[PDB]
Amino acid sequence: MKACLSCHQQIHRNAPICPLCKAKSRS
């Protein structure tokens, strides 16, 4: 359960993380 920052989404499980979010939402 992670929260996509800079791209407003909630990922219930670690799904395909976003280019910006693997950075911003910390992954």
Ligand SMILES: [Zn+2]
């Ligand atoms: Zn994202």
